[PDB]
């Protein structure tokens, strides 16, 4: 499942322990003089 369209998170029978997820996480540089965690992501595929 390429990111964005349907079938972006898979699983077989719905209990647990196995996933598949490729949404393109990358980590960015924090600001000059603050404390937060930056974060970048193509938005979700189910609720689009």
């Amino acid at each position: 499942g390429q990111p964005g369209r349907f079938g972006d998170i898979q699983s077989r029978t719905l209990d647990s322990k196995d996933l598949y997820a490729n949404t393109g996480l990358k980590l960015a540089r924090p600001a000059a003089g603050n404390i937060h965690v930056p974060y970048t992501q193509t938005p979700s595929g189910f609720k689009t």
Binding site: A28, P30, A31, N34, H36, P38
Partner: protein, 102 residues
């Protein structure tokens, strides 16, 4: 008549001078919008869009004083996007704003 203060406003009635309390000073544009520091003849505010701006308070013997004029504005879109409140990471740009000095 003469001393400095941060609580009582001064208005007029007939021929004489009255007073009222600053803590019931209200404005409206289409919802409420807050005041951010004032003195003199002037007030200055941050208000969401609409078509009127109204300024009111409470006079001496518990009545109200209103006025509604017509004015039109929008958010001016600095950057290339349309938001409402400033988020917590990103670029800084040049902007122009008001001082709060004397």
């Amino acid at each position: 008549t003469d001393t400095h203060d941060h609580t009582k406003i001064r208005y007029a009635e007939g021929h004489d001078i009255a007073e009222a309390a600053r803590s019931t000073l209200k404005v409206h544009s289409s919802s409420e919008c807050a005041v951010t520091g004032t003195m003199g003849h002037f007030i200055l505010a941050k208000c969401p869009p609409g078509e009127v701006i109204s300024v009111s308070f409470v006079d001496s013997k518990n009545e109200q004083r209103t006025c509604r004029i017509a004015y039109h504005h929008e958010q001016r879109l600095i950057g290339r996007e349309r938001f409402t409140v400033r988020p917590h990471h990103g670029i800084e740009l040049p902007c122009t704003t008001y001082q709060l000095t004397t």
